[PDB]
Nucleic acid binder design. Structure first.
Ligand SMILES: Nc1ccn([C@H]2C[C@H](O)[C@@H](COP(=O)(O)OP(=O)(O)OP(=O)(O)O)O2)c(=O)n1
Ligand SMILES: [Mn+2]
Ligand SMILES: [Mn+2]
Ligand SMILES: [Mn+2]
Ligand SMILES: [Mn+2]
Length: 438
DNA sequence: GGGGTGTGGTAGC
DNA sequence: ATCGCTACCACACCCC
């Protein structure tokens, strides 16, 4: 057990945090793409007609943790038992749950205690531990398989369990559903073999947005090919508004208020005007949703196809620790800030950059919120405060950065005992060139 | 037009 | 117990 004022806290927390693992795995994949392709020109041009294959593991953590489960879980059955991956037993996040669990209404991100309430009597939840190294190894097999197939011009990492793979069609070749179906089945079988039993589903389309919707329709353990010329009422009727890219809870709430509570993308499609859409959720989001409902990508989304190196290039660097923050005095806060800056500068030096602007964000307990929230060591109900500072010269100097980070904390005026979370950020990154005579 | 700030939402999730 | 991370875009509103 490692408390936040222990030097080992950052290491222990990140070792246990599945969300830290997801973010670090994604950042590593982005860096590997940029280094694999230092010379290879990977971009899609306007001359290219392309097909998108959006490929994603089915309940990734749950599948892998089950396949690699310890002897205590030998009799566990993946197709018959509701299985979750989590740390705890009560207010612990379900990182992933299998499709049996989902048939009862359980979802990723729910708390274990919330999920147990949805099971009828006689049905018990099986909770498996995290297997972080195996998650990474199966993802390696996944990405290696996608390359070995030699069928994609461009393989874009989306996450540990997910990639956008692009196939350019020569104007002389006649693409067919049958050819796409066989590619989907090849990919699914080769990854199933290469991962020793994990399944992926595949959305296949001529837009990024349709491939994402096709993928959702394909799941679990299937594929779906839906081109813009294949669009239909049956297709749109199969999705909730939440399924549209760019629509999270806050946008969903606004769309439900503005358009008489639609219950499918087919509902929304028939009720919306572009202008009321923009008014409800915002101008750029409203235009994105408008295009998405026609099967079409927006300018912002297409950038990853036409300039992936620029898109996947890292422009900021940060850490966020909003769990286990319980400090008694400012000396201990300041030491934690120093440890966080040391960790971030180690990353900054690994990528051979300097930073010219930094940000500190904190979570502060709301005045009438309990000192100890429902979730053990949780941040609880808070408000956020951030403040940033431009540095004189771009720097990688600990003394400058840590001093300014501690000044930003001082500026924000949060009593140490009220602190519930900290984020430390390097906002603008500058390359270190061969010439440093200044 | 150009620049900036802190806040908020969502993509990974 | 329990491990609620990270990057980027968009916005409202300020400067000149
Ligand atoms: N709230 C969440 C959502 C996802 N994940 C982790 C666990 C997932 O297994 C993994 C991949 O995320 P996905 O969105 O791809 O979800 P799954 O792979 O679990 O299920 P599926 O994609 O079949 O819906 O990311 C998490 O930790 N917390
Ligand atoms: Mn998945
Ligand atoms: Mn995924
Ligand atoms: Mn959504
Ligand atoms: Mn997902």
């Amino acid at each position: 057990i490692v408390a936040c004022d222990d030097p080992d806290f950052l290491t222990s927390y990140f070792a246990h945090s599945r969300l830290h693992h997801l973010s670090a795995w994604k950042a590593n994949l982005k860096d590997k793409f940029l280094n694999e392709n230092i010379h290879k020109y990977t971009k899609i041009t306007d001359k290219d007609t392309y097909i998108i294959f959006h490929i994603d593991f089915d309940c990734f953590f749950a599948t892998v943790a089950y396949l690699c489960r310890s002897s205590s879980f030998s009799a566990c059955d993946f197709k018959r038992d509701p299985i979750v991956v989590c740390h705890g037993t009560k207010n612990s996040d379900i990182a992933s749950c299998n499709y049996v669990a989902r048939s009862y209404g359980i979802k990723n991100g729910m708390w274990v205690s919330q999920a147990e309430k949805m099971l009828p009597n006689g049905i018990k939840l099986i909770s498996l531990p995290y297997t972080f190294e195996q998650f990474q190894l199966k993802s390696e097999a996944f990405y290696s398989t996608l390359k070995r197939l030699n069928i994609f011009n461009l393989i874009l990492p989306i996450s540990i369990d997910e990639a956008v793979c692009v196939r350019i069609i020569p104007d002389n070749i006649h693409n067919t559903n049958t050819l796409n179906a066989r590619l989907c089945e090849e990919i699914r079988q080769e990854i199933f073999q290469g991962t020793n039993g994990c399944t992926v589903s595949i959305g296949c389309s001529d837009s990024l947005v349709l491939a994402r919707l096709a993928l959702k329709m394909a799941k679990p353990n299937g594929y779906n090919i839906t081109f813009k010329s294949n669009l239909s009422e049956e297709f749109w009727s199969s999705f909730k508004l939440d399924d549209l890219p760019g629509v999270g809870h806050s946008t969903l709430s606004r769309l439900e208020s503005t358009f008489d509570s639609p219950h499918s993308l087919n509902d929304l499609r028939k009720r919306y005007t572009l202008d009321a859409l923009k008014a409800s959720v915002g101008s750029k989001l409203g235009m994105k949703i408008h295009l998405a409902l026609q099967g079409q990508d927006d300018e912002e989304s297409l950038k990853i196809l036409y300039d992936p190196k620029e898109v996947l290039q890292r422009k900021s660097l940060s850490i966020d620790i909003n769990w286990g923050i319980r400090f008694k005095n400012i000396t201990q806060v300041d030491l934690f800030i120093e440890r966080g800056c040391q960790y971030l500068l180690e990353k900054l030096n690994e990528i051979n950059k300097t930073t010219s602007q930094i940000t500190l964000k904190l979570m502060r307990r709301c005045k009438d919120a309990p000192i100890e929230p429902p979730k053990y060591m949780g941040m609880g109900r808070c408000d956020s405060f951030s403040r940033s500072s431009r540095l004189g010269i771009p720097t990688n100097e600990f003394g400058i950065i840590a001093t300014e980070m501690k000044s930003l904390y001082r500026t924000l005026g949060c009593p140490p005992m009220e602190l519930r979370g900290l984020a430390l950020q390097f906002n603008k990154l500058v390359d270190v060139g061969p010439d440093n005579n200044q």
